[PDB]
Amino acid sequence: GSHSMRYFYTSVSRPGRGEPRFISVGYVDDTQFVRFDSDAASPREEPRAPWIEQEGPEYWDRNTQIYKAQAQTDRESLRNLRGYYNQSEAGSHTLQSMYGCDVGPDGRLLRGHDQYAYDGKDYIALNEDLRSWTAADTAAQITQRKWEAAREAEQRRAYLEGECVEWLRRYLENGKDKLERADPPKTHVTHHPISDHEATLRCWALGFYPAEITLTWQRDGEDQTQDTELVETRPAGDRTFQKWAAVVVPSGEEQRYTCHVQHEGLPKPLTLRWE
């Protein structure tokens, strides 16, 4: 199937209390394999998956040096953003970065991603063409113009089309079955009486990987979006995921409703009923 590599950076300024906290996590698909945190005792890239532990000490030393430079870069990005938005120097602010590559089963690039948020809001994103920018507001336009003039997109394109793909391919080889697996959802429906005149149907999906899933209810084939309670997809702790969808139904009309599950691990989506 298809695969992604992503790095997620979080920087958080703390004025008068030293350098901003910088945290990176790295993912293949929904598997975290690395982390770096500037607050940790000896800040070092650390493994967080078994299949990346085989990398030698030079790999950890190298990535450590990279994150250390990244932390200083983000600190200066935060300084710059404060000016653009003309803000106090007294309060805390957040800069988030997300970048990586998607590859098809053939292992070639499908799509590169490179994008930023300031204080939880879109700031700037590299377009799918990897040659041009979408700025979220007039401040981001300042960043856009300096990046266009300096042709910094070309350097970002080289990482995403080149290295990003090579590292992902090597991590997929390292991981074998633990990354090429799709675990289908374990699915069932439970009935919970509310009154004489109403009952809750809860449709469950357990132990699925990857996290992407669609869980929906239908009344005789019709959408129940506004009448469906739907919990956020949640981790089990063992690198599988969980979800449920509930809908309050008039008692006796249970046969009218159907739960629909779509997941990579299901070639055909499931239709669960209550008879």
Binding site: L95, T143, A158
Partner: peptide, 9 residues
């Protein structure tokens, strides 16, 4: 591995 090109916003 993480990218070793850096960019100031």
């Amino acid at each position: 591995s993480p990218r070793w090109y850096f960019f100031y916003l």
